[PDB]
Amino acid sequence: EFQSGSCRDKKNCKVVFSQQELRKRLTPLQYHVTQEKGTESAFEGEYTHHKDPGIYKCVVCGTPLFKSETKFDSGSGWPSFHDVINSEAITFTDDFSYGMHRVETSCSQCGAHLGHIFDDGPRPTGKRYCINSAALSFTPAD
Ligand SMILES: [Zn+2]
DSSP, rough: OOOOTTTTTTTTTSOOHHHHHHHHHHOOOHHHHHHHOOOOOTTTOTTOOOOSEEEEEEEETTOOOEEEEGGGOSSSSOOOOOOOOOOGGEEEEEOOOOSSOOOOOOOOOOTOOOEEEEEEOOOOTEEEEEEEEEEEEEOOOO
Protein backbone atom coordinates (compact mmCIF):
# COMPACT_ATOMS: atom_id res chain seq x y z
CA GLU A 1 0.00 0.00 0.00
CA PHE A 2 3.07 2.24 -0.35
CA GLN A 3 5.81 3.05 -2.89
CA SER A 4 9.28 1.56 -2.50
CA GLY A 5 12.49 1.12 -4.44
CA SER A 6 14.52 3.19 -6.86
CA CYS A 7 15.29 1.95 -10.35
CA ARG A 8 18.42 0.35 -8.85
CA ASP A 9 16.29 -1.89 -6.62
CA LYS A 10 14.17 -2.73 -9.65
CA LYS A 11 17.33 -3.26 -11.73
CA ASN A 12 15.83 -1.20 -14.57
CA CYS A 13 17.71 2.11 -14.50
CA LYS A 14 18.20 3.76 -17.88
CA VAL A 15 21.75 4.72 -16.87
CA VAL A 16 24.06 2.43 -14.87
CA PHE A 17 27.62 3.17 -13.72
CA SER A 18 29.91 0.76 -11.92
CA GLN A 19 30.53 1.49 -8.26
CA GLN A 20 34.23 1.69 -9.15
CA GLU A 21 33.64 4.52 -11.62
CA LEU A 22 31.44 6.34 -9.09
CA ARG A 23 34.00 5.96 -6.28
CA LYS A 24 36.53 7.88 -8.37
CA ARG A 25 34.24 10.50 -9.95
CA LEU A 26 32.30 11.46 -6.76
CA THR A 27 33.65 12.75 -3.47
CA PRO A 28 33.17 10.35 -0.55
CA LEU A 29 30.19 12.45 0.57
CA GLN A 30 28.60 12.58 -2.88
CA TYR A 31 29.03 8.80 -3.11
CA HIS A 32 27.55 8.19 0.36
CA VAL A 33 24.55 10.45 -0.27
CA THR A 34 23.60 9.30 -3.77
CA GLN A 35 24.60 5.62 -3.51
CA GLU A 36 23.94 4.79 0.15
CA LYS A 37 20.96 7.08 0.85
CA GLY A 38 23.15 9.20 3.08
CA THR A 39 22.33 12.72 4.28
CA GLU A 40 24.89 15.51 4.43
CA SER A 41 25.02 17.39 7.72
CA ALA A 42 23.06 20.61 8.08
CA PHE A 43 24.76 23.42 6.14
CA GLU A 44 27.50 21.08 4.87
CA GLY A 45 26.58 21.75 1.21
CA GLU A 46 28.07 24.37 -1.10
CA TYR A 47 24.69 24.85 -2.75
CA THR A 48 22.74 25.58 0.45
CA HIS A 49 23.66 29.28 0.39
CA HIS A 50 24.07 29.63 -3.37
CA LYS A 51 21.90 31.94 -5.48
CA ASP A 52 23.53 32.07 -8.92
CA PRO A 53 21.17 31.55 -11.89
CA GLY A 54 21.55 28.17 -13.54
CA ILE A 55 20.42 24.57 -13.51
CA TYR A 56 21.02 21.87 -10.89
CA LYS A 57 21.46 18.37 -12.30
CA CYS A 58 21.79 14.89 -10.85
CA VAL A 59 25.44 14.75 -9.84
CA VAL A 60 25.58 11.11 -10.94
CA CYS A 61 24.01 11.07 -14.42
CA GLY A 62 23.50 14.73 -15.38
CA THR A 63 19.69 14.65 -15.68
CA PRO A 64 18.42 18.22 -15.13
CA LEU A 65 16.48 18.44 -11.87
CA PHE A 66 16.00 21.97 -10.49
CA LYS A 67 15.94 25.56 -11.77
CA SER A 68 17.58 28.33 -9.75
CA GLU A 69 14.38 30.33 -10.13
CA THR A 70 12.56 27.93 -7.76
CA LYS A 71 15.32 27.86 -5.12
CA PHE A 72 14.45 29.43 -1.79
CA ASP A 73 15.90 29.76 1.70
CA SER A 74 14.05 27.28 3.92
CA GLY A 75 16.33 27.78 6.92
CA SER A 76 16.58 24.00 7.12
CA GLY A 77 20.27 23.44 6.35
CA TRP A 78 19.91 21.97 2.84
CA PRO A 79 19.12 23.26 -0.65
CA SER A 80 15.37 23.86 -1.08
CA PHE A 81 13.36 24.19 -4.32
CA HIS A 82 9.62 24.72 -4.77
CA ASP A 83 9.38 22.80 -8.07
CA VAL A 84 11.17 20.30 -10.29
CA ILE A 85 12.05 20.77 -13.97
CA ASN A 86 9.74 17.91 -14.56
CA SER A 87 8.42 15.22 -12.28
CA GLU A 88 9.31 12.28 -14.57
CA ALA A 89 12.93 12.90 -13.48
CA ILE A 90 12.05 11.91 -9.88
CA THR A 91 11.18 8.61 -8.21
CA PHE A 92 9.03 9.26 -5.10
CA THR A 93 9.00 6.56 -2.42
CA ASP A 94 7.60 6.28 1.08
CA ASP A 95 10.22 6.59 3.83
CA PHE A 96 9.17 5.17 7.23
CA SER A 97 12.50 5.51 9.07
CA TYR A 98 12.60 6.86 12.63
CA GLY A 99 8.92 6.14 13.28
CA MET A 100 7.81 8.96 10.96
CA HIS A 101 6.55 9.25 7.38
CA ARG A 102 8.43 11.16 4.68
CA VAL A 103 8.56 10.95 0.89
CA GLU A 104 12.08 10.27 -0.39
CA THR A 105 13.12 11.69 -3.76
CA SER A 106 15.51 9.80 -6.06
CA CYS A 107 16.68 10.29 -9.64
CA SER A 108 14.42 8.24 -11.91
CA GLN A 109 17.19 7.75 -14.50
CA CYS A 110 20.08 6.43 -12.39
CA GLY A 111 18.50 5.87 -8.98
CA ALA A 112 20.67 8.36 -7.06
CA HIS A 113 19.26 9.37 -3.69
CA LEU A 114 18.52 13.13 -3.75
CA GLY A 115 16.51 13.95 -0.60
CA HIS A 116 12.82 14.37 0.35
CA ILE A 117 9.78 16.41 -0.65
CA PHE A 118 7.65 18.17 1.96
CA ASP A 119 4.35 20.10 2.02
CA ASP A 120 5.69 23.19 3.84
CA GLY A 121 6.96 24.98 0.73
CA PRO A 122 6.06 28.43 -0.51
CA ARG A 123 3.58 29.44 -3.14
CA PRO A 124 2.93 28.72 -5.92
CA THR A 125 3.31 24.96 -5.32
CA GLY A 126 3.36 24.63 -1.54
CA LYS A 127 6.15 22.07 -2.05
CA ARG A 128 9.67 21.91 -0.63
CA TYR A 129 12.09 19.68 -2.47
CA CYS A 130 14.74 19.31 0.25
CA ILE A 131 17.81 18.10 -1.66
CA ASN A 132 21.36 17.24 -0.59
CA SER A 133 23.86 19.67 -2.08
CA ALA A 134 26.03 16.59 -2.60
CA ALA A 135 23.36 15.01 -4.86
CA LEU A 136 23.55 17.93 -7.34
CA SER A 137 25.86 19.53 -9.88
CA PHE A 138 25.32 23.15 -10.89
CA THR A 139 25.57 24.56 -14.42
CA PRO A 140 25.64 28.38 -14.53
CA ALA A 141 23.19 30.09 -16.86
CA ASP A 142 24.65 31.32 -20.16
ZN1 LIG B 1 20.71 10.49 -11.93
